[model samples]
Target chain A: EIPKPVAPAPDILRCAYAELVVTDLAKSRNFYVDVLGLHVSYEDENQIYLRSFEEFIHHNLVLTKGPVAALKAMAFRVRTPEDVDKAEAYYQELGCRTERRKDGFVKGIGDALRVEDPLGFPYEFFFETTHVERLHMRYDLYSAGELVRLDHFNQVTPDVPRGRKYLEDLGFRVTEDIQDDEGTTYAAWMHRKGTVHDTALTGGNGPRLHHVAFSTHEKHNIIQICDKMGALRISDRIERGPGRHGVSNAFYLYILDPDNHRIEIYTQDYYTGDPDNPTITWNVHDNQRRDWWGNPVVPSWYTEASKVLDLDGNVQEIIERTDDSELEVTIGADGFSFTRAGDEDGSYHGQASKGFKL
Target chain B: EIPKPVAPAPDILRCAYAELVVTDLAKSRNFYVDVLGLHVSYEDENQIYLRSFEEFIHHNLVLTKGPVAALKAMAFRVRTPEDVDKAEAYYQELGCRTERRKDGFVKGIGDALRVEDPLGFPYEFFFETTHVERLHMRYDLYSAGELVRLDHFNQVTPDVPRGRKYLEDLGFRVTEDIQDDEGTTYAAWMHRKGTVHDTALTGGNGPRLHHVAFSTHEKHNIIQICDKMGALRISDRIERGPGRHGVSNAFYLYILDPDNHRIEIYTQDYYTGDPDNPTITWNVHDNQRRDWWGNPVVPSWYTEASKVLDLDGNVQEIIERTDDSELEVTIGADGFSFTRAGDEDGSYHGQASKGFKL
Candidate 1:
């Protein structure tokens, strides 16, 4: 039987920031400021808060010097202050670890709670923080700066379904979902507000970061950044982008943070904020569902993410899912395609051709 | 006098392909195929050839397993076979080691010569190779299997202007250039034919590889590759992308090769084939110039490129630019703004509306 399409939850806010631990704060600071060109919202000896021109929050990226480069935490800003309390209670009821702070943890932040979600990923809930005035007015002077906001964060997890459920329960919506043929495993994108994703979960090892993406309102902003890197004689830091994706209808660029944590500047996602937006499900045989227009998945994007650590300071072990899910069916033994969109016959036919060959 | 935009030397054809040395052939192969999802044009035990959907060339990326993960060599396809001898004579005159191979080096490659350019970067010149049938008609099926054709490559160097002159002498043309007020240093995009670049030099301490990019015809193909990786339980490898750029007028995505050499999938660049195409010169003071639309350049794009080696196997030392060039500008030194296309001042006007204190 065809599954009924699910409606996305409402009152979703955008991605706020990601917390990362690095071995050297100074090096990380130099890398972000001197190379990537992110503005420092605030900084102390131990930590630095950064924001892109597109962000309205005090910070979009956070860095802390620690034992190693690990995704320490991620934060999502909700619509109202009461939503922070709601999230705290909700996660607490799910038997997760929760910490609440009255005065907030950082300078611009007002009050917040830190919690481990049901899937065991570190997340923070905050509604109050000092807002940075929009910097879009100086368009002529800053013609190349294009990023606008924090877009999405991808997390690796053993159980993607559980992660999706937990985020869905907290008012997130599924824009697109993929499953293997047997439907035993899954990967999904959950959206908050009007952008493509606030967070995403891929079935894999436990609670590690895949990447965090920021948004640029216009497409050219991405190219301008690459050119600027060249002009600045710091082009080595340009790891990837400016490119388009079939899914989410966004453009993107990826560069490594000082700690080797992958950060993406992305934009142009389809509007999923509508109450009746359909949660598109893709079959493993649907070749174009993943990219909708480009090539197959490369190996590094799967294995190159920063490792996660347990509270005991050990590398966490994650269980692998064995399912007939689309991810498994397409990427497993026979190797199917995801470059085409919506075709369920396992055939590659799409408007966005990739010029692929087997 | 303001220099009129220079036209490319007549003998240049286009970028042939780039050769990258990898520590792990299988890993690099997987990254190109599984994550970024380029179509595997051909592969052997020691090497793999790849291409994107938009390419007419036989290959875009060549991965060779070697002692280290480094950019071993680069190649460019010239207009005529005679251009190969010209390249050999040119580098030899620069007092660099040059080797002329009568027999083709690799299986599909033709007779070629290997040498180091004036700036001490390894490159190969060959004018003969078997041409695969152009796959433009098969673009519809390209993304289903592997994409077709090779795209462009980027390199790192200490002196941007010197590298630019060296490439220009080899018949390359600069499509875009960026500079600071003093013009102490510069970075420019040069191409053999009209694509984005056969190779680009980012001024720094030494010569290295930033990344190599492949092109796709459609945007969705990129996202499909990312989603496929998630389904494969290998989403950790997705380094970045599925985004657009302000400069290149294309969509892009980046994935790390097995040895961490970055491979970008990109498409939709404005035509440089026109003789009158303008050479865009961005000001160093324009913070938005790097990302015309206003996204920040990530730190990794600056620091995480492949290292260069001398003939004796020692790390090459990089020379610093004489002055702080356009590349030295920081994004957040003062608050910056995003760029809007129709804005009178060419800067973002929204900066003040965000209520930023600074």
Candidate 2:
């Protein structure tokens, strides 16, 4: 890893929002606002701003009309407006590209700093956002699968240790990680907020956006999202889950937008707010590490990810993973998988391959 | 309504178990054990005893192979063994048929009293039962849709007020009810166990079993049951919901067994344990009374229900509903409906008719 940045990292409040680039705004709009029932803070022909039920900010998501589908920026809410400047200094000290926007880059948020980190992902920090009505008590307007708040973001990077180190330097704590008995780090979940991860680094191709997640009040909300999708005859868009994650113990469902940008509907992950909260390390060979029910992960989730954009709006170059891939290690003969540790065969006791039947 | 019995009602702890008669045990077993992932306490070719994750009793449900599909009995656990004698005296005083089983009517339970109640429904009361493992912490065995405990049962009968009063006499508290402006009681929810209802009386054909419900830890568990059904290509069994009930505010899904017995997977209802828990009343015209999201109720849900068996295993005759049907009062031109109260036209603001899109 590169030498640690001498500058102090900015104080982060939470994983706030992400700006997503989509090829067609209407199709993406139908998926997020129409099908999924996300509240629209503001919208026009070119872009639509969206927020979940509990959000008082202008928006938690911004879907912009663009030439290609990519993640424009992964933004975090800073504790103070001056923290934006600290973000500028921190990234610049590491010899990374930095930009400051005093007027604001997107609507409802102000005094922001955008940075292209050493890992090639676009990261943004901001404070002083416009306030709006939080729809938490608006039960009449709630859909069956009501999304409450933005939870976390997952990024794909070639080097797990380096990604984890860079995030730690930026004031993130690792709450969970996946590793092999041979000491290879496959993925790591780092958090700035109290729940689980604000951003997770999955060992894969560099500079890709794995997924952005929004949380529901209960696990049923995640299921209803999938149910609504199934009813809409768009069940194929459901990429994985409605299963419990062994790492975070969160119930989750993965869905792909029209441009193939992955979004996760997540809920029920435990609190990791205590300063000395223990980090959970999962064995790579454990079948339940990915899905607690021992359901097999689809190959596409590991192989596919959204491209990321730079400050100049160009797609960042991707780097191939150097470590052993999690997909390969778990699926084939090399990995000794078992539902219970005592079982010899790797067969899952559940309705095996049930999710795939659809 | 019939006069109150001179003898006091038994002290019921909670709604305990239900015995359902299914023509084919294999198909019923597939629905309960294989697909839904309930634990089998004991099973044979003719019968299967099932329990949920948090249950320690011998079984919460029993499926018996029979000549016709019917609900054999709706059982209640009494506070004391002496309460069984009280139940016998109370029902006998009410001039309904009663029988005492010293050993047990079914396996696991003992010292049971069976009665043909004034409403013509078969009811069972017992205080003693065998204890088994409560699988609360068995994360290894948890399916995506894990049933935790028996929640409630819904019964259909012609007279809601009569049913409600009878249940109140039997020591159940009314938690919620539905009514028309004309003062017609459409349905009522009552409980002995602190949740919304241990049993609900839906105004419809007499002496029919509307549904037996089981609780899940979260709403997502209910949705997973529907998803698993979808995967197995038995989604037709999902009769109604995977929706929030406006009446109880409980997230719910109703699935039908092969015998047409409705089983509701429910979660997230408000606790009604307080002695003075205010009874929630809803207008029959409120579109969201059954489903908060304004999803329409399927016609079959209102018209069809499982037959109830007498003490001699004979299917009880049903009486026609004399009051205005909930379906007729809400769906058509006669009823003045609106999503919000002020709107003249009854167009639901949501994705109307969405659950039916499938």
Candidate 3:
């Protein structure tokens, strides 16, 4: 607080895409394109680009061959072409690492700016993306759980207040969050677009991605994806949810790629258009805060996340959190939690500490 | 036109509710209330009022008992309390049969307007209703195919052009339509809501109820309903889609209630907020017009509909269509159609008449 940040770029748009490093392009492509049913934008031997049903961009996701599975960057679109210039200057003003690339790293994008933000997350800012025909009318090819847009991203950072401060400075507003009477801020839902959140900050490791979420149009679509996965005999890939979330108020399903990187299919978060919309807060002890139905949050979701990369696409160094880790006090061996006080008492202790039972 | 119809209501809020008459309230209630996962507003021995997760209104659907299955009214909400007065005057000015109930016919609703329009459909209008607490944040009680709201209604009317005229006169804008080069209108999508349509007119029998649709958040939810129906050994109830509509570009599925009332689960229709939004038209011969991906529409959807009732709750008389029947021309024993001239050349001829494949 002593050395205040200066001139943060106003209006960071919604999460547009994520550059993911996959071990096997064929396996990952099968999950994203064939099963998940995202449209093929274009692809080659080293990389494949994909877009959703309503997207008019060349791609909303990029899957590439890398030695280890990781996230190269969590990308966001800004309002104007000049916003990229502002992003570079903004990050540079914070004295964090920043780079301006005249030729974008991705195929469809033009100029872009890559920044190592205060939380150590690699953030890519861009405006100019080559357009493609939006396939909104192409019902001929849609599968169940048809993804339509890159909705939001979830990042694990050591400092929730720091993440909130940087996001607020960049003109993002908090819609919902989790907190405790001990004055601990566990997570925050921040948005620029009309939805509950364009990105969320979950307390955990530094520069790691909790997940990259895609928007589906209905709740049944999420169920169908899980159904298809069950039929395919890969139910374990369904990591968490197909349940309602208390934080964003979204109907959701969480799945894992072959590399254990999380992918979320989400729908129906309410609009947060009013500037003075009351920010909703939840007590961290509330069982329904994570899964609205009081379904237990899986331990892996809190413990695991994909490592992020720097401007040069090298994986960033891990920085451990000193704050209260959600997994520890919520569900692990050291945890004491109940579904509710009066109703059926439950526990995620001992044998269940390995994973979720409910 | 004759008497130049009186000044129309400026705007309609959205498709608010559907009052259906079921023979056995228990059977229909099991299907909608239990299986479909709608939150109960309130219910009695004679009727059951239901709402979607996000609705704050008393109910979005009502099932009342009758000797036979029928529609009581296809209801629409207005923007303000004065719109009820606007509706009574507007419908009366058009020389249509109009009834105003200041005391209300339903439990939680206030002053209302009921009209038998030029097309002989029982349409209801209301401005005020007892507001219920919106359960959007109550993730604890959502069903797998959790219906969020009543999306639209489809009416089976003999004349699409006639239905379109009255709806347009009421300030509804045409978003999409199915027609022939010879000026035969098969169907027209009109809306007062921001979505594709609130109530659609399909060329069919006189003043019948085609289907009442519920909004879900994703395609998988629709599939899950089908999957659960399959699990429940009632897969036979799954009627038409889990397919996409070429007309509105929405992912949809159709089912049959115990009373054989058509129930549609729908999602993902695009925004139509602009006054000058381009109107989409499809040729009557195009197989994809009804289904974008060329999925064959179920014969039941075209041939079957629930009879509607008058204000006295008596079944209204039916009328015949002088126009070409879409089911007769597009599918079934008397029909022959092709997806493309040289393509698979599909038809609902012989063994294919029951329903769609997949």
Candidate 4:
């Protein structure tokens, strides 16, 4: 008999793009263009849109100069244009500030609806898209050339469940999830396409962007980028990755934008489109939940994010809620473990042991 | 007849530790201890010493609080106690200032000698160590425990060969190097131990600490740290790694200290102890040399490093020279490549095509 596959939640499309507020447009532009090598889709004095080599979307990243280099917004695409209107009305009825635009500032996103969630994070929903010819196809030899569509993003919010409800109302599905061992806290992955999550929400005191991830074609591409960086004498900016992740089943490398906002190039995620994609649940003790290979998360990955400010240039205040299950569990604290991939019994492999000796 | 093993360099032991300067002691302390899971060996108002789980050294990292967070100093171990004195006298004879101390300020080291190199980077040479029992030997695991041993460091300097010659005179050996097509520039890896490098000098404008790396026993440990960070909602600070390096034969991850100084956790390097171990070289066209996998290097790794300041908090001026083959040949405008392990002929593999869905 054929083994049954793990079933995941329904219909999650690729991440569209992330909207960021930067302190200096020029510095950010130089960082994305000169440092990280993202192609400039278009740029104005106030804004800039960037795309990776493999993106079908006109822009995979949008940067708006503002008070700080913080996440100003996030966006995702749906299957049909009507879904955008449905989202606008639904969010508006839920007391959110919603606006529909016919001409998007980004190319290809001809129509979209923007909404300010009750918690203060701006989000956009749309269906229209434009494709760029695949640069990776021709530039296979370019060391840092990117090769996949946008992947996933992690977000921080005062209430994870409420945020989930708001997103679920617009038709996102949760795949894998985690809870503190005490069962008092929670975090969930929600996607509109398939597999696990296109977006994840963790309980925090405010609505903030955690990090945005892109996908590359092969694991070696990630290493090639690093080698090219060393050759360029710029290897110092590489923040992390070239490891396997349990959560996404992908290899990754995270690099810092000039503003220190993170852009993760990731790929090889499991097939969530199938009804059998596993819906992983972790109880804080699962060490492999984040990394299948079992590496430690660095502190900067947690504490050193771009700071967000309001329209008036003051740091924005987000609602701090207790009773929320997501808010209670702390990440990076002492004493947690998870499952490693291919380890059915959750035992760790000895890849690290082979090279442990001097 | 069996092939004769290459005789390795003598007068060197292992990488000892790296010392970094920070603007705020408490902030840096919290970041290293709380976020990265490093064990605090000792802490005073002005400085703090930390170690990983596998380290036998008293400390693998030292953080000194001062007016700014900059690359203050780096330290390495020689084969014997006399080497410290020899290094001091050698540099002093070279017309450089040197400091000698019998007992180190940090807990683990015994006799040590400090010196200001001709390039102005501060370096310490020492032997005679007091070992701390390995913490990771405990079968009982903690959630986000760190492994031990100080590893390699990267420095930004105006002249590569000059800096390299200074260390070579002190008995460091060049194991691998890279250069561009014209061979006008070069960057070399030198080590005292079996792992790829105990320290690396990159050609740049001035003397500055690029980053210091630690070693972990397993790949999962790196991921465990990342998961804990995600659980703690502190995953933003992870700067780079969990990727592979073709040159070093290791997996790596980097995190930022509160002052933006970098601390890397790395493992799995090939042994360089054998004398016949071929000293590998690369041309800029060999994309795999820097990154065995062929990823592009990020710019911050090259340009955005902590500036070195004098005792009075003023940025120091550095001199640059032309006709310097080392500076002109590696990475930046030059081109070179190296061989991927297990591969002959240094052909471009472009393995990145596998992970990403182009």
* Candidate 1, residue B123: lDDT: 75
Candidate 2 Cα errors over 4 Å, as ranges: A1-358, B345-358
For model 1, the superposed segments whose C-alpha errors exceed 4 Å read: A1-358, B1-10, B53-58, B139-141, B144-146, B230-240, B285-287, B309-322, B325-328, B332-358
Q: Per-residue lDDT of A102-201 in model 3, one digit per residue for the tens?
A: 8898899989887787788778889889999999988887777899888988988888998798788788899999887789999999888889888899
Sort by DockQ, best first: what order? 2, 4, 3, 1
| Chain A accuracy as TM-score for every candidate | 0.82, 0.95, 0.93, 0.79
Q: How accurate is candidate 4 locally (lDDT)?
A: 0.63
Please list the residue runs of candidate 3 whose C-alpha ends up more than 4 Å from where it truly belongs after superposition: A1-4, A8-10, A338-358, B1-358
Candidate with more favorable, higher lDDT: 1 or 3: 3
lDDT of 2 at A93: 83
CAPRI tier of model 2? incorrect
Higher-ranked by DockQ: 3 or 4: 4
- For all candidates in order, the CA lDDT equals 0.63, 0.81, 0.77, 0.63
Judge candidate 2 against the unseen true structure and give its global Cα lDDT, from 0 to 1: 0.81
Residues B306-337 of candidate 1 have per-residue lDDT tens digits of 87655444555666555453323533334334
| Order by TM-score, highest first | 2, 3, 4, 1
**TM-score quality measure for candidate 1:** 0.50
Tens digit of lDDT per residue, candidate 2, span B85-202? 9888888888889999998999999899999999998899999999999899999998988899999888999988988888888889998888877989998989887988899898
Residue A202 lDDT (model 2): 91
Question: What does candidate 3's lDDT look like per residue over B1-358, in tens digits?
Answer: 3244646663588888988888888888889877888878898999999998999999988899888788898888888888888788777778888888887778889899888877778888898899999999887887778888788888888878767876777888999988776778898999887799888888887789888888888776776676566445454466665656668877778888888888888898899989998999877766556655443455556778889998787888999999898766665445555445344433334222112221
Best by TM-score: 2
Model 3's alpha-carbon lDDT is: 0.77
